C-alpha cells in the first residue's frame, strides 16, 4: 500500500499564492524522484515540476520562477509552492512517484486548484417535478437543479445516499463565473408522493448544505 495523498488545493485569486502538500507512505520516500503533474479541465496532462532525491529541481518554462517544488524527507512530504498564479494554472494537481525511466508509477487522488477573481457563492437548489398536467407512466423522473455556485465542487445525493441507482448527476457547467449542475433520479410510479424524495446538496467552499424535497406540482 504505497500511497500519495495531495491536499491544500482550492480557490485562489490571480496573482495569488498557494501551497500544495503531498504526504507519502508505504515506501522509502528518499529513494525516489517526486513529480507534480496537473490535468486541465480539458483533461490535458502536463508536467509541472520534478525534484530529485537530493533536492535537484526542474521546471518547464511556463511555471519556472513562479512554482517551487520542495521535499521533507523527515516527514515524507512533497510540496508545491505556487505563486503569481494565473487562470491557466487552474487544474487538478497530482503528486506522482517517478522512476529512473521517467514513468510515474504511483499517483495520488489529486487536489483541485481554481485560480479566479470570482467570489465564493453558495448554490440555489430548485426541485424539478413534472408539470401538474403531466401524465403518469410507470417510472417517474425527478431532479434537482443546482444553480449559481462557485467554485467547484458540489456533491449531490438522493435520500442521504439511500437512493443510489437511477441517478444521473451531470458535470457542472460554468457560465458568467457561476456553475450550474443538474441531477436526475428515476423511481417507480407508486413509489412517489408516497415515499419522500429529497436531494441533498453540499457546497463545502461555502460551508453550505441543503435538502430540497421534491413535491408533486399542483395548479
Amino acid at each position: 500500500e504505497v500511497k500519495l495523498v495531495e491536499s491544500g488545493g482550492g480557490l485562489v485569486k490571480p496573482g495569488g499564492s498557494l501551497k500544495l502538500s503531498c504526504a507519502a507512505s508505504g515506501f522509502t520516500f528518499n529513494n525516489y524522484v517526486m513529480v507534480w503533474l496537473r490535468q486541465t479541465p480539458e483533461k490535458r496532462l502536463e508536467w509541472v515540476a520534478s525534484i530529485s532525491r537530493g533536492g535537484s529541481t526542474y521546471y518547464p518554462d511556463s511555471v519556472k520562477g513562479r512554482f517551487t517544488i520542495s521535499r521533507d524527507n523527515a516527514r515524507n512530504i512533497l510540496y508545491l509552492q505556487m505563486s503569481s498564479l494565473r487562470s491557466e494554472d487552474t487544474a487538478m494537481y497530482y503528486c506522482v512517484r517517478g522512476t529512473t525511466i521517467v514513468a510515474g508509477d504511483v499517483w495520488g487522488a489529486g487536489t483541485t486548484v481554481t485560480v479566479s477573481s470570482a467570489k465564493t457563492t453558495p448554490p440555489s437548489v430548485y426541485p424539478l417535478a413534472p408539470g401538474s398536467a403531466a401524465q403518469t407512466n410507470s417510472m417517474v423522473t425527478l431532479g434537482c437543479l443546482v444553480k449559481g455556485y462557485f467554485p467547484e465542487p458540489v456533491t449531490v445525493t438522493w435520500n442521504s445516499g439511500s437512493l443510489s441507482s437511477g441517478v444521473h448527476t451531470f458535470p457542472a457547467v460554468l457560465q458568467s463565473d457561476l456553475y450550474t449542475l443538474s441531477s436526475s433520479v428515476t423511481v417507480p410510479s407508486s413509489t412517489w408522493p408516497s415515499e419522500t424524495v429529497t436531494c441533498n446538496v453540499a457546497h463545502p467552499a461555502s460551508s453550505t448544505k441543503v435538502d430540497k424535497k421534491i413535491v408533486p406540482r399542483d395548479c
Binding site: 490535468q39 483533461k43 522512476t99 514513468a103 504511483v106 437543479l145 444521473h168 443538474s182
Partner: protein, 215 residues
C-alpha cells in the same frame, strides 16, 4: 518539446474486439522512455505499460504495447467493459516530459432511445426572478444526439446550457441535460416550452413540452 499525437481520438469497440491505438512522436524517442497510462472515469491516471512493452503492476495480460522510434502502439487483445477509459502515452526521454492528448475508448452496445423528461421552473426560482426549463435525455445509445428548444413554437438557441454524462459503467448508455434559462419576465410572456431530441433511434424527434398554463 516532443509532441505526442494519439489516434484515433475516440474509438468505439465491440466487446471481445482486438483494439489497437497509436502514439506518434514528433522526434525519435528511446523506447525505454515511452510509457502508457490508463485513466478510468472519475479516477487518477494509472501506469499501464512502461518502457514500450512492459505491463505495469495489476495490468491484465490482454494488454500489450510495441513500437520504436517515433511510432508506438497499445493493443488490447479483447475489449472488456472494464477497459472503457482514456489511454495516454507519455515520453520521458526529453525535458519537458510530455503526454499525448489521450485516446478515449468506449464500448459498443445495442441502440437505446433516450427517455426524455421536461420540467418547468420551480416556484422558488420564479420568486428570485429567474426561470429555467430543464430537459433530461437519459440512457441512450449511440452517444450522438441533438436537442432543439422552442418557445411558443419558435426555435430558441441562446440561454441553453448542455451537459453530458460519461458512458454509464453498468449499461454503457449516455445521458444528457439541457437547461434553457430566461428571466421570470420572459417566461411569463410565453406559454409553450418544448425540447425536441433528434436521435438515431427514431425517424421523428422525441418531443416533450408543457404549457405554462397547464393545470
Amino acid at each position: 518539446d516532443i509532441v505526442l499525437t494519439q489516434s484515433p481520438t475516440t474509438m468505439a469497440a465491440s466487446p471481445g474486439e482486438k483494439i489497437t491505438i497509436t502514439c506518434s512522436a514528433s522526434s525519435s524517442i528511446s523506447s525505454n522512455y515511452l510509457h502508457w497510462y490508463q485513466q478510468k472515469p472519475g479516477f487518477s491516471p494509472k501506469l499501464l505499460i512502461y518502457r514500450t512493452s512492459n505491463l505495469a503492476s495489476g495490468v491484465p495480460a490482454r494488454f500489450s504495447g510495441s513500437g520504436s522510434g517515433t511510432s508506438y502502439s497499445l493493443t488490447i487483445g479483447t475489449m472488456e467493459a472494464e477497459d472503457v477509459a482514456t489511454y495516454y502515452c507519455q515520453q520521458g526521454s526529453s525535458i519537458p516530459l510530455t503526454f499525448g492528448a489521450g485516446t478515449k475508448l468506449e464500448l459498443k452496445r445495442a441502440d437505446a432511445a433516450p427517455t426524455v423528461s421536461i420540467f418547468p421552473p420551480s416556484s422558488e426560482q420564479l420568486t428570485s426572478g429567474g426561470a429555467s426549463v430543464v430537459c433530461f435525455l437519459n440512457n441512450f445509445y449511440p452517444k450522438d444526439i441533438n436537442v432543439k428548444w422552442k418557445i411558443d413554437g419558435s426555435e430558441r438557441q441562446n440561454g441553453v446550457l448542455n451537459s453530458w454524462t460519461d458512458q454509464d459503467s453498468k449499461d454503457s448508455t449516455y445521458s444528457m441535460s439541457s437547461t434553457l434559462t430566461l428571466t421570470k419576465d420572459e417566461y411569463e410572456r410565453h406559454n409553450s416550452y418544448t425540447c425536441e431530441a433528434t436521435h438515431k433511434t427514431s425517424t421523428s424527434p422525441i418531443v416533450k413540452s408543457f404549457n405554462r398554463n397547464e393545470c
